[PDB]
Amino acid sequence: SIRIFPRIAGRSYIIYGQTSGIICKRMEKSDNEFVIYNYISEHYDKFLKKYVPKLYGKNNDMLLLEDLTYNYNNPNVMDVKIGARKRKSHTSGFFSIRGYTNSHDYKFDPDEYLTSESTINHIKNFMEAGGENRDKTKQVLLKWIMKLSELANDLFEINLKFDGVSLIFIYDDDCSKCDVNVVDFSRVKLIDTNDQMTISAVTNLIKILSELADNPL
Ligand X SMILES: O=P(O)(O)O[C@@H]1[C@@H](OP(=O)(O)O)[C@@H](OP(=O)(O)O)[C@@H](O)[C@H](OP(=O)(O)O)[C@H]1OP(=O)(O)O
Q: Which residues bind ligand ADP (CB under 6 A)?
A: 7-12, 14, 23, 53, 65-69, 77, 79, 166, 168, 183-184, 186
49 is in an annotated binding site: no
H-state helical runs in 80-132: 116-127
- Dihedral sign, CA of 206, 25, 86, 75? negative
Nearer to ligand ADP (CB atom), residue 9 or residue 148: 9
Q: Is 85 annotated as a binding residue?
A: yes
Using the rule CB under 6 A, give the single segment among 45-53, 56-64, 82-90, 151-159 that binds ligand X.
82-90
Kindly state whether residue 33 participates in binding ligand X, applying the rule CB under 6 A. Answer: no
212 labelled binding-site residue:
no
d(CA 135, CA 27): 41
CB-nearer residue toward ligand ADP: 65 or 205: 65
| DSSP code string of 132-179 | S-HHHHHHHHHHHHHHHHHHHHHHTT--EE-TT-EEEEEEETTSS-EE
With H, G, I as helix, E, B as strand and everything else as coil, classify residue 66: strand
Helix (H) / strand (E) containing 47: helix 45-51
Min dist. Cβ of residue 189 to ligand X (A): 12
* Residue 20: burial class (beta carbons within 10 Å; 0-12, 13-18, 19+): exposed
Dist CA 169 CA 183 (whole Å): 11
Residues 171, 111, 116, 121: is their CA dihedral positive or negative?
A: negative
Answer with the entry of Mg ion, ligand ADP, ligand X, none that 86 interacts with (C-beta below 5 to 8 A by kind).
ligand X
Whole-angstrom Cα distance, residue 70 to residue 11? 22
Piece in contact with ligand X (CB under 6 A), picked from 7-15, 117-125, 174-182, 204-212 = 7-15
Query: Among residues 186 and 204, whose Cβ is nearest to ligand ADP?
Result: 186
| Residue 46 site contact among Mg ion, ligand X, ligand ADP, none (CB < 5 to 8 Å, cut-off depends on kind) | none
Indicate the annotated binding residues for ATP: 8-9, 11-12, 25, 66-68, 79
The footprint of Mg ion (CB under 5 A) covers 10, 166, 184
The footprint of ligand X (CB under 6 A) covers 9-11, 81, 85-88, 98, 110, 164, 184, 186-187
Indicate the annotated binding residues for 1D-myo-inositol hexakisphosphate: 29, 81, 85-88, 187
